[PDB]
Amino acid sequence: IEALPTHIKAQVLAEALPWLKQLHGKVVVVKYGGNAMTDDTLRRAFAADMAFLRNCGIHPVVVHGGGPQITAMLRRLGIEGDFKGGFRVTTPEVLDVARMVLFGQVGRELVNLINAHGPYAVGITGEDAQLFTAVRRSVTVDGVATDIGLVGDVDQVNTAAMLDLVAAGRIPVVSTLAPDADGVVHNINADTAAAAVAEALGAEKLLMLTDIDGLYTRWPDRDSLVSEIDTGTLAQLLPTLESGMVPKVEACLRAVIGGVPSAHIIDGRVTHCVLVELFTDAGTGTKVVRG
Amino acid sequence: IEALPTHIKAQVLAEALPWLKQLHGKVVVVKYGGNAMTDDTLRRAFAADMAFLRNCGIHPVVVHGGGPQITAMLRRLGIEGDFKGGFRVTTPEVLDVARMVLFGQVGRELVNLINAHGPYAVGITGEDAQLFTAVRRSVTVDGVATDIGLVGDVDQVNTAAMLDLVAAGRIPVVSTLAPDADGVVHNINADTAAAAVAEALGAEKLLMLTDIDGLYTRWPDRDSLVSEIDTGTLAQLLPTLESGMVPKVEACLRAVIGGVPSAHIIDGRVTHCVLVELFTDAGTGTKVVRG
Amino acid sequence: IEALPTHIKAQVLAEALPWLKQLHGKVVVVKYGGNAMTDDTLRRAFAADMAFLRNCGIHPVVVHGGGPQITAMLRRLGIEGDFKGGFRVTTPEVLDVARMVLFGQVGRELVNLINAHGPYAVGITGEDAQLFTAVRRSVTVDGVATDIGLVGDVDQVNTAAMLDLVAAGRIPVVSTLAPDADGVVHNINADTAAAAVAEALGAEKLLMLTDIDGLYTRWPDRDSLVSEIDTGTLAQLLPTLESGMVPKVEACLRAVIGGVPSAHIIDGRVTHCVLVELFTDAGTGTKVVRG
Amino acid sequence: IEALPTHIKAQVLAEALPWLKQLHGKVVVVKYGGNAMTDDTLRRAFAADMAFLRNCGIHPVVVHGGGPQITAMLRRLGIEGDFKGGFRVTTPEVLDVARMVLFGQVGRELVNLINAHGPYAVGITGEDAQLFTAVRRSVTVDGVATDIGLVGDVDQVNTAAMLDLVAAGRIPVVSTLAPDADGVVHNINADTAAAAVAEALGAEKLLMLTDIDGLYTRWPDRDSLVSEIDTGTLAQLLPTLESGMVPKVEACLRAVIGGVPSAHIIDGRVTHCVLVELFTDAGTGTKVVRG
Amino acid sequence: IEALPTHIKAQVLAEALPWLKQLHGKVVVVKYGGNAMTDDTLRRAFAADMAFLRNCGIHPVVVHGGGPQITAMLRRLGIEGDFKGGFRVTTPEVLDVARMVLFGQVGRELVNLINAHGPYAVGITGEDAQLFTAVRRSVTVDGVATDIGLVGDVDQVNTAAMLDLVAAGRIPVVSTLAPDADGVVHNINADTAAAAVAEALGAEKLLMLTDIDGLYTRWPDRDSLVSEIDTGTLAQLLPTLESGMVPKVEACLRAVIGGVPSAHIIDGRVTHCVLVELFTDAGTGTKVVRG
Amino acid sequence: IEALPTHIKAQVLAEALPWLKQLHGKVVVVKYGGNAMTDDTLRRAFAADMAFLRNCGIHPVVVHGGGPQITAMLRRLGIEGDFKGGFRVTTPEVLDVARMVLFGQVGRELVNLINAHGPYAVGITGEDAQLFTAVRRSVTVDGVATDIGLVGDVDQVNTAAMLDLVAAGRIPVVSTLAPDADGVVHNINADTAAAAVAEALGAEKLLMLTDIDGLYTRWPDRDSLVSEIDTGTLAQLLPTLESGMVPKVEACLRAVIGGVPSAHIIDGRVTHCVLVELFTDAGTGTKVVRG
Numbered sequence A, B, C, D, E, F: 001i002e003a004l005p006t007h008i009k010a011q012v013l014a015e016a017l018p019w020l021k022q023l024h025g026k027v028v029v030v031k032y033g034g035n036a037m038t039d040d041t042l043r044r045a046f047a048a049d050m051a052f053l054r055n056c057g058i059h060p061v062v063v064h065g066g067g068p069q070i071t072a073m074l075r076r077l078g079i080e081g082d083f084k085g086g087f088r089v090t091t092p093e094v095l096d097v098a099r100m101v102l103f104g105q106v107g108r109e110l111v112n113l114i115n116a117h118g119p120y121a122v123g124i125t126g127e128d129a130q131l132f133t134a135v136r137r138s139v140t141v142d143g144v145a146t147d148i149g150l151v152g153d154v155d156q157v158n159t160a161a162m163l164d165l166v167a168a169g170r171i172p173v174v175s176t177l178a179p180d181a182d183g184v185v186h187n188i189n190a191d192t193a194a195a196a197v198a199e200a201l202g203a204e205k206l207l208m209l210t211d212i213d214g215l216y217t218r219w220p221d222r223d224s225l226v227s228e229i230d231t232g233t234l235a236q237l238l239p240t241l242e243s244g245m246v247p248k249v250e251a252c253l254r255a256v257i258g259g260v261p262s263a264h265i266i267d268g269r270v271t272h273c274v275l276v277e278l279f280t281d282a283g284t285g286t287k288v289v290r291g
């Protein structure tokens, strides 16, 4: 990076300006998961980019997953799973584990990484200050809607209290657990929770970190990779994508139809992917806009 | 409670007034542990008293322990302990468990209990917003000061940021983990952390919930139970008490010599012990004052 | 009160919590008169309950009468009364006396009693800061509407300026005099003024202290005493009650139809009646709600 | 006033500017009494000048007396006086009358007069919000210090709370009664109370309205009238003035030695004397400055 | 001014009060030009009256012209003019001169004059903080609408940012230059810009200083001078007035139809004309009101 | 810039982070002159970097010169110069020109350039709101201190009012003219004014744009170019540098001895020199620190 001439270093920074202007004072919700969460270089870069946004006057909000870590802890505790379709049933016991891992392990690692740069990160769940509630959700296996326990969707969000937190200069790191109307805590899918938080907060962008270059229309045709697409036609392509990018795509449509100006599916295996997606035009991701 | 005449119900409430006046707008730090944490009626009463304080314009701050729950989780995970003296060595592995249990299990239960009354509780540790730091602590076994791993005392406290949280009408529920100056998270004894938080916040009172009637000078002489004592003579009685009330007593002296007007050791096995200690003169506890 | 066990003292305080939650941060307007104003123990208790509300974060507003004290001062000054029906005509001279007694004697006693607990009470009339205006009122004697001088109803209220006063932590003590649109000060009935203030301020409750157990439907049948009634049927019972509880009942209907969630007619001869009505379920009063 | 040319009307207003600049945003305490209080044209002019100051962004504070009105009310009530020296003894009964007349009659008239111009005036005494306290004072008759009942000097003043009131755009009208440390209300001499309020509030000027042209050094020599004098030499002239201007002079010295930049003894028999003293150089009054 | 009795000095100041009340806390926009700008006594008086308004809590906003000064500078620089009709074409070169003279000479003189009284004046143009924009304007010569270069009308105004400036206690002195939507700065007629600023700011009055006694209906008939007129009939008299008072009249109609309660054409050759127009009833000007 | 790989674009932006953290919420004063002011590409880049800083939450303050533009305007106006030493005497006439050019031409161009990015720039001089004063300065020619007219140094600065302006999100663009204590406006050297503003505002950095690579100790030895130097030894090198970098060096010493953490002499001929100096380590400039 030292053999690179100085006048091109200048140019790269100057080309950030249109996006610094767009994002200044705005909320950006980031779904964090995948390899961006498991490799130590990626992780550290992610935390530094969160500090970057904050030290530009941008208001990042982090929503994290943790599927594989929950599973490993269940196996360590010898908790036998029940499975309907390909879904583990979330008993009261599985939820206690899920909450303890998400909030007391996975969330903690990110908060500490970010806080290496300053007193920025703060961890929360829907339980704290009743920041958001959940509604129990069913799944459809082999055509029939079925109960798989204490798993929900975000119901309502405390928009005011959450925007207080970010105006104080803090970076919320959200673990997706929240209680229903009777106080019963549910585990929420991180991808959908992020889209819901983004719409409730009036975010300027939603970013989804995933382990992909971007959205392929006809995977695996390499020339099917797309850089921008509207919600109308993306909704039509939904039943034709692999099972893994379904929830990431649904989040994007749900957020952009909710009024979030754009959602982005970006490559979490790229170091500093947030910086490249937000402050350069050389992004590999896929941008979703309404239409 | 219905056969009790109405004019004595009036008198009991009216006698709360001198203490409502003393505590209005003030911080009260409460160490929560023991049976007040394990029995479901006690627990529920505790959470309701926290809501009580808040709905009087008092600012409670809860610091909780969780020793036995950490141990049970270590045994469930098959994590073999190392012991110097009677102290488990806190390896990096034991800390991850301690943090996950304290913050992702024990803290969560209290937050949800309190939040049944309103959007009040919020959980935090020293890691969040760098609210407090830790300094690694040694112990003295058989006369020699020895390392027992990632266990510390509270070093510095972010007084301003924490008092912001309570002025917003929130009830912090603190899990005693905090990073040292190099970002390495340590587990802090809950009793001492509570005394440190109380002095840093300028609390009007520190309350220590324990499984005792109060401080006995010559346990087990029933007529040795004391209701008030000064720090000077309490410091002299310290080497003569059973090992369990040592840390609770040290917390009280350290807090009251730090300027907290009074610390109280009260009976956590009594339903609504906080209400009786703060709003009545029939408290069984022991009050510590400077002298 | 000392022979009463401690665990029932706890229970009485804990049962206040649902009402502390309901009233926290809310305005409660209290009409003060009758024996609660003339007996020194009752008075002192009343003032202490006003301090109680304030030291819970509740915002009391006191409206007081003083009929008998005006009369005694008129007799002391040798001011001969004119009477139409059973109404003294309020000449300019009678008003000067009424204002001087209400604001410079009766209001002063309450302010000083309350202020024994802190710098809380502040006395005012509609004249100060133009806080409310009056409209001259007629009475109907023997079927004909007749002028009885400078006696009015509350016309408009300065809601903003009055709610400033209470947010400053002050307890307004209102003497019911106010000028009309031409600057001419009138004396307003205290019961009706209290209902008007309560509706203008968005009070959560209106309390009317009177010298009765509660509203009897068929006085004197002891089994006609009612604990709750709606405005629709209370309006039907109005022409059938003794002349003294008419104005207290009209105040309640007018306030609750104005949107005040409930008005209460409570026994001012009971020490700490405000505490028992607001923080216990053993109230003897009568609650009025809309319907 | 119509035959007066327009370009001299311009000049008179333009010459106000140096004093508008000096007084803008500043407190001016005005002792109001004498004929400025009893004649209806003077009174009305006084109230209009208070509105003038307020509508310039000046913060007037009015302190009023009422000696003769108290006396007339005592005679009307048949209250026999006790006299030591030339001082009526202020029994508990005399005080109730004094307070009722000052606050419920004399203060009310001024508040209503001022409020004809806007919602400006608000009446208060030391009792309200504990705005100031009193200390019982003795008098010296025939060489010996003697008790004359519930008469005091201003002890402490709630500077913060009072300056809140004026920043809200209100004009306090103070009746000089205040409680001592035991809650016992005393009557304070209005002239001295005004000097105390002026020093506690950091007033820019104290104005004393009196029934005189100004301070005569050798009354009645017409050529002894002075327009400015320092505190050092005014203190020397004190034992040589008629009994009536003693308290007005003592107020001025006490205020100006307290740091009030200047005190002024002005002719209350002159219509709009406040306007002429503050906004013109043709004042007849006497200015006191430190030296 | 010294031979004038003191009690009439009082009366002149007291008669200001109804207008101090009307204007307190309100915006007053003043178009400044003509002889009030060129004679040193008039100028100094003008600046002192601006300080007067400010030291009454009134918020003046000054808009200035400078036609003749631009012309003299063009002649000094040897810049040959192009003329269509009687209009100089404003080339890019003429604008640079116009802006440099208006903002860097004429505006500076006024700011310094006002600032002799305090830190009040601040100079601005539409360019600063994008406070207002311009739209290019045509003129009609001999019946045809024609381009005369970079001359415009005020397009949009930043009402919020400008009212911030005055709430800070500052007196804006506006030079009428502003950029169009493409960033191209235009010169705006000062009379029309003042009417636009007055309507955008919700001014209570617009004052137009001119070199006339007032509006004559049938100039030169001396008995045709009018003191008040409504917009409806003033619009009918527009095509019948001399070319010089056309733009001043159009400003008044445009402002008063925009909701400004009244616009005034006053004699700038009168020392302290602003003081006489605003604070006396002996104004020579012409008041415009809607109708 | 497109053939450059994306992962190095990421790295260049990520390496900005330590300096975004250092500068966030801080004042940076920038002296703007030289070729950075005359070439249209440099100029545009400069204005974009000012918008960059602002859209990072940094508070830039621009101080500009304009020596050559004043000279050209004097020659255009045929104003014959008087010269003592190599200094033009600043007569009242020369100052009017200097002020008109600096504030009404040179300042305007920068404000409009910056404002192409948003409503950021606002132009001011010491005259506006009395933001800073000047003290007349002498020069020493051939050994003797001599008067060269209305040329000064910055005397006092209104730190509070200026920091208000930047907290509002504005970018002040300062033209260095200010009045002395008698209201007489002087022209101040831009380099020294910038150092004075930087110390008065508590700036984190002072940047001096010049037409040089950096400070050469032994110009022209290419290997004498320095990247960092302390004030102690820089003060010793002062009498040994070419006449042009003297004032730039004096500014740096005066600012850094005034407590500004570092001053920087950077190459204004480099496009985006501000971005490279502040956000990269490949700066060519010279950093001055205390020592």
Ligand SMILES: COc1cc2cc[nH]c2cc1C(F)(F)F
Residues within 6 Å of the ligand: A122, A124, A128, A129, A161, A162, A164, A165, A168, B122, B124, B128, B129, B131, B161, B165, B168, B170
């Ligand atoms: C302002 O609200 C908060 C502040 C802090 C500071 C540390 N943790 C916090 C959690 C919150 C919460 F949860 F209320 F949003």
Ligand SMILES: COc1cc2cc[nH]c2cc1C(F)(F)F
Residues within 6 Å of the ligand: C122, C124, C128, C129, C161, C162, C164, C165, C168, D122, D124, D128, D129, D131, D161, D165, D168, D170
């Ligand atoms: C804020 O307004 C007030 C404050 C105080 C403090 C003592 N008496 C007061 C009366 C008022 C009033 F009357 F404006 F409400």
Ligand SMILES: COc1cc2cc[nH]c2cc1C(F)(F)F
Residues within 6 Å of the ligand: E122, E124, E128, E129, E161, E162, E164, E165, E168, F122, F124, F128, F129, F131, F161, F165, F168, F170
């Ligand atoms: C608050 O805004 C301003 C303040 C000051 C102080 C001096 N000049 C100022 C110009 C402005 C502006 F231009 F933003 F209105």
